[PDB]
Protein backbone atom coordinates (compact mmCIF):
# COMPACT_ATOMS: atom_id res chain seq x y z
CA UNK A 1 0.00 0.00 0.00
CA UNK A 2 1.12 3.56 -0.74
CA UNK A 3 -0.24 6.74 0.83
CA UNK A 4 -0.69 9.72 -1.47
CA UNK A 5 -1.73 12.74 0.64
CA UNK A 6 -1.87 15.00 -2.42
CA UNK A 7 -5.42 13.74 -3.05
CA UNK A 8 -6.46 15.53 0.14
CA UNK A 9 -6.39 18.66 -2.04
CA UNK A 10 -9.52 17.39 -3.82
CA UNK A 11 -11.39 16.96 -0.53
CA UNK A 12 -10.19 20.31 0.83
CA UNK A 13 -11.30 22.08 -2.36
CA UNK A 14 -14.89 21.20 -1.36
CA UNK A 15 -14.52 21.80 2.40
CA UNK A 16 -14.81 18.01 2.80
CA UNK A 17 -12.88 15.15 4.38
CA UNK A 18 -12.71 11.56 3.29
CA UNK A 19 -10.75 8.74 1.71
CA UNK A 20 -10.27 7.36 -1.76
CA UNK A 21 -8.77 3.89 -2.15
CA UNK A 22 -7.53 2.64 -5.52
CA UNK A 23 -6.32 -0.85 -6.43
CA UNK A 24 -4.33 -1.52 -9.62
CA UNK A 25 -5.33 -5.09 -10.53
CA UNK A 26 -2.45 -5.81 -12.95
CA UNK A 27 0.17 -4.63 -10.45
CA UNK A 28 -1.56 -5.80 -7.26
CA UNK A 29 -0.83 -2.40 -5.71
CA UNK A 30 -3.05 -0.13 -3.66
CA UNK A 31 -3.02 3.62 -3.17
CA UNK A 32 -4.96 5.86 -0.78
CA UNK A 33 -4.81 9.35 0.69
CA UNK A 34 -5.42 8.09 4.25
CA UNK A 35 -4.27 4.60 5.26
CA UNK A 36 -6.18 4.89 8.54
CA UNK A 37 -9.57 5.87 7.13
CA UNK A 38 -9.07 3.44 4.21
CA UNK A 39 -9.39 0.69 6.81
CA UNK A 40 -12.14 2.27 8.95
CA UNK A 41 -15.34 0.24 8.85
CA UNK A 42 -18.65 2.07 8.32
CA UNK A 43 -22.25 1.16 7.61
CA UNK A 44 -22.39 0.30 3.86
CA UNK A 45 -25.80 1.95 3.29
CA UNK A 46 -26.86 1.48 -0.33
CA UNK A 47 -23.51 -0.02 -1.41
CA UNK A 48 -25.09 -3.08 0.25
CA UNK A 49 -27.36 -3.27 -2.82
CA UNK A 50 -24.44 -5.09 -4.52
CA UNK A 51 -24.39 -8.15 -2.20
CA UNK A 52 -28.15 -7.94 -1.65
CA UNK A 53 -28.70 -8.12 -5.41
CA UNK A 54 -26.37 -11.10 -5.76
CA UNK A 55 -28.08 -13.03 -2.98
CA UNK A 56 -31.57 -12.19 -4.24
CA UNK A 57 -30.67 -13.44 -7.73
CA UNK A 58 -28.97 -16.59 -6.52
CA UNK A 59 -31.92 -17.53 -4.28
CA UNK A 60 -34.48 -16.76 -6.99
CA UNK A 61 -36.02 -13.79 -5.16
CA UNK A 62 -35.16 -11.85 -8.33
CA UNK A 63 -35.69 -13.93 -11.47
CA UNK A 64 -33.88 -11.63 -13.90
CA UNK A 65 -33.11 -7.97 -14.56
CA UNK A 66 -36.51 -7.41 -16.24
CA UNK A 67 -38.77 -8.64 -13.43
CA UNK A 68 -41.00 -5.79 -12.21
CA UNK A 69 -41.29 -4.96 -8.52
CA UNK A 70 -44.50 -2.99 -8.25
CA UNK A 71 -44.61 0.15 -6.13
CA UNK A 72 -46.35 -0.52 -2.83
CA UNK A 73 -48.30 2.75 -3.16
CA UNK A 74 -46.66 4.50 -0.19
CA UNK A 75 -45.44 7.93 -1.27
CA UNK A 76 -41.84 8.49 -0.20
CA UNK A 77 -39.69 11.61 -0.39
CA UNK A 78 -37.54 10.47 -3.33
CA UNK A 79 -39.94 10.74 -6.26
CA UNK A 80 -38.22 8.14 -8.43
CA UNK A 81 -39.00 5.54 -5.74
CA UNK A 82 -42.76 6.09 -6.21
CA UNK A 83 -43.08 3.84 -9.27
CA UNK A 84 -42.48 0.28 -10.45
CA UNK A 85 -38.84 -0.84 -10.79
CA UNK A 86 -36.72 -3.61 -12.18
CA UNK A 87 -33.22 -4.53 -10.96
CA UNK A 88 -31.56 -2.05 -13.35
CA UNK A 89 -33.66 0.92 -12.29
CA UNK A 90 -33.75 -0.10 -8.63
CA UNK A 91 -29.94 0.05 -8.60
CA UNK A 92 -29.84 3.29 -10.60
CA UNK A 93 -32.30 5.12 -8.32
CA UNK A 94 -31.15 3.25 -5.19
CA UNK A 95 -34.68 2.17 -4.34
CA UNK A 96 -34.45 1.19 -0.67
CA UNK A 97 -37.95 -0.30 -0.22
CA UNK A 98 -37.43 -2.73 -3.10
CA UNK A 99 -34.26 -4.02 -1.42
CA UNK A 100 -35.91 -4.12 2.01
CA UNK A 101 -38.46 -6.54 0.57
CA UNK A 102 -35.68 -8.62 -1.01
CA UNK A 103 -34.00 -8.86 2.40
CA UNK A 104 -37.21 -10.02 4.10
CA UNK A 105 -37.61 -12.74 1.47
CA UNK A 106 -33.97 -13.79 1.82
CA UNK A 107 -34.33 -13.94 5.60
CA UNK A 108 -31.77 -13.55 8.34
CA UNK A 109 -30.35 -17.10 8.32
CA UNK A 110 -29.53 -17.07 4.59
CA UNK A 111 -28.38 -13.45 4.65
CA UNK A 112 -25.89 -14.21 7.41
CA UNK A 113 -24.58 -17.36 5.73
CA UNK A 114 -24.15 -15.50 2.44
CA UNK A 115 -22.24 -12.59 3.97
CA UNK A 116 -19.92 -15.06 5.70
CA UNK A 117 -19.41 -16.86 2.36
CA UNK A 118 -18.62 -13.47 0.76
CA UNK A 119 -16.14 -12.55 3.58
CA UNK A 120 -18.09 -9.26 3.63
CA UNK A 121 -16.91 -6.70 6.17
CA UNK A 122 -17.50 -7.71 9.77
CA UNK A 123 -20.18 -10.24 8.66
CA UNK A 124 -22.56 -8.98 11.40
CA UNK A 125 -26.21 -8.57 10.38
CA UNK A 126 -27.49 -7.62 13.84
CA UNK A 127 -30.52 -5.35 13.67
CA UNK A 128 -33.66 -5.50 11.57
CA UNK A 129 -33.42 -7.95 8.68
CA UNK A 130 -34.74 -5.19 6.41
CA UNK A 131 -32.51 -2.33 7.60
CA UNK A 132 -29.28 -3.65 9.19
CA UNK A 133 -27.18 -2.11 6.39
CA UNK A 134 -28.72 1.28 7.29
CA UNK A 135 -28.91 1.19 11.09
CA UNK A 136 -27.71 -2.23 12.30
CA UNK A 137 -24.40 -3.93 12.99
CA UNK A 138 -22.80 -4.49 9.58
CA UNK A 139 -19.55 -2.54 9.06
CA UNK A 140 -17.19 -2.53 6.08
CA UNK A 141 -14.09 -0.51 5.24
CA UNK A 142 -13.06 0.89 1.88
CA UNK A 143 -10.29 -1.69 1.49
CA UNK A 144 -12.79 -4.45 2.41
CA UNK A 145 -15.15 -3.17 -0.29
CA UNK A 146 -12.31 -3.53 -2.77
CA UNK A 147 -11.61 -7.13 -1.70
CA UNK A 148 -15.28 -7.97 -2.22
CA UNK A 149 -15.52 -6.16 -5.56
CA UNK A 150 -12.43 -7.96 -6.87
CA UNK A 151 -14.14 -11.30 -6.26
CA UNK A 152 -17.23 -10.05 -8.07
CA UNK A 153 -15.18 -8.86 -11.03
CA UNK A 154 -13.55 -12.29 -11.38
CA UNK A 155 -16.83 -14.24 -10.82
CA UNK A 156 -15.26 -15.73 -7.68
CA UNK A 157 -18.01 -15.08 -5.13
CA UNK A 158 -20.01 -18.04 -3.77
CA UNK A 159 -22.97 -17.48 -6.13
CA UNK A 160 -23.55 -18.40 -9.76
CA UNK A 161 -21.77 -16.86 -12.73
CA UNK A 162 -25.14 -15.66 -14.04
CA UNK A 163 -25.95 -13.80 -10.82
CA UNK A 164 -22.56 -12.08 -10.89
CA UNK A 165 -22.92 -11.10 -14.55
CA UNK A 166 -26.41 -9.67 -13.97
CA UNK A 167 -25.27 -7.58 -10.99
CA UNK A 168 -22.27 -6.24 -12.93
CA UNK A 169 -24.69 -5.22 -15.71
CA UNK A 170 -26.88 -3.50 -13.13
CA UNK A 171 -23.84 -1.66 -11.72
CA UNK A 172 -23.17 -0.04 -15.09
CA UNK A 173 -22.76 3.69 -14.41
CA UNK A 174 -20.73 5.30 -17.20
CA UNK A 175 -19.07 4.20 -20.41
CA UNK A 176 -17.37 5.82 -23.36
CA UNK A 177 -14.48 5.03 -25.64
CA UNK A 178 -11.91 5.56 -22.87
CA UNK A 179 -13.36 3.66 -19.89
CA UNK A 180 -16.27 1.83 -18.27
CA UNK A 181 -17.34 2.50 -14.67
CA UNK A 182 -19.39 -0.09 -12.78
CA UNK A 183 -20.21 1.14 -9.30
CA UNK A 184 -22.74 1.78 -6.56
CA UNK A 185 -23.30 4.86 -4.38
CA UNK A 186 -24.22 4.90 -0.72
CA UNK A 187 -25.47 7.46 1.79
CA UNK A 188 -25.44 6.58 5.49
CA UNK A 189 -27.58 9.11 7.42
CA UNK A 190 -29.27 7.15 10.21
CA UNK A 191 -26.23 6.62 12.46
CA UNK A 192 -23.28 8.94 12.94
CA UNK A 193 -21.01 9.71 11.30
CA UNK A 194 -23.11 10.67 8.25
CA UNK A 195 -21.08 9.61 5.21
CA UNK A 196 -21.30 9.10 1.47
CA UNK A 197 -19.78 6.18 -0.44
CA UNK A 198 -18.92 5.33 -4.01
CA UNK A 199 -17.46 1.90 -4.73
CA UNK A 200 -16.77 0.02 -7.94
CA UNK A 201 -14.15 -0.14 -10.65
CA UNK A 202 -12.89 1.41 -13.88
CA UNK A 203 -12.36 -0.99 -16.80
CA UNK A 204 -9.62 -0.05 -19.24
CA UNK A 205 -8.46 -1.91 -22.33
CA UNK A 206 -5.59 -3.62 -20.48
CA UNK A 207 -6.24 -3.18 -16.74
CA UNK A 208 -8.91 -2.61 -14.15
CA UNK A 209 -8.70 -0.12 -11.31
CA UNK A 210 -10.91 -0.86 -8.32
CA UNK A 211 -12.03 2.05 -6.16
CA UNK A 212 -13.81 2.67 -2.89
CA UNK A 213 -14.30 6.12 -1.39
CA UNK A 214 -16.20 7.52 1.54
CA UNK A 215 -16.53 11.08 2.79
CA UNK A 216 -18.26 13.02 5.53
CA UNK A 217 -21.76 13.99 4.37
CA UNK A 218 -23.46 16.31 6.89
CA UNK A 219 -26.25 17.14 4.44
CA UNK A 220 -27.55 15.74 1.17
CA UNK A 221 -26.31 18.81 -0.77
CA UNK A 222 -22.88 17.24 -1.22
CA UNK A 223 -23.89 13.87 -2.65
CA UNK A 224 -22.47 14.72 -6.09
CA UNK A 225 -19.05 15.17 -4.49
CA UNK A 226 -18.80 11.40 -4.11
CA UNK A 227 -18.33 11.00 -7.85
CA UNK A 228 -16.65 14.36 -8.48
CA UNK A 229 -13.84 13.85 -5.94
CA UNK A 230 -13.26 10.28 -7.11
CA UNK A 231 -12.99 11.46 -10.71
CA UNK A 232 -10.44 14.13 -9.71
CA UNK A 233 -8.28 11.36 -8.22
CA UNK A 234 -8.77 9.10 -11.23
CA UNK A 235 -7.79 11.97 -13.53
CA UNK A 236 -4.73 12.82 -11.42
CA UNK A 237 -3.59 9.19 -11.63
CA UNK A 238 -4.11 9.14 -15.41
CA UNK A 239 -6.70 6.38 -15.16
CA UNK A 240 -9.30 8.47 -16.99
CA UNK A 241 -8.46 11.43 -19.29
Ligand SMILES: C=C(C(=O)O)[C@@H](C)[C@H]1OB(O)c2cc(F)ccc21
Nearest residue numbers: 045046047093094096134185186187
Ligand atom coordinates in the same frame (compact mmCIF):
# COMPACT_ATOMS: atom_id res chain seq x y z
C1 LIG B 1 -29.78 7.77 -3.93
C2 LIG B 1 -28.97 7.61 -2.91
C3 LIG B 1 -27.47 7.46 -3.12
O1 LIG B 1 -26.98 7.65 -4.27
O2 LIG B 1 -26.73 7.19 -2.13
C4 LIG B 1 -29.51 7.54 -1.46
C5 LIG B 1 -30.50 8.69 -1.22
C6 LIG B 1 -30.18 6.22 -1.28
O3 LIG B 1 -29.23 5.17 -1.52
B1 LIG B 1 -28.71 4.78 -0.28
O4 LIG B 1 -27.40 5.05 -0.14
C7 LIG B 1 -29.83 5.11 0.73
C8 LIG B 1 -30.03 4.72 2.07
C9 LIG B 1 -31.13 5.23 2.74
F1 LIG B 1 -31.38 4.87 4.04
C10 LIG B 1 -31.97 6.11 2.11
C11 LIG B 1 -31.76 6.49 0.81
C12 LIG B 1 -30.65 5.98 0.12
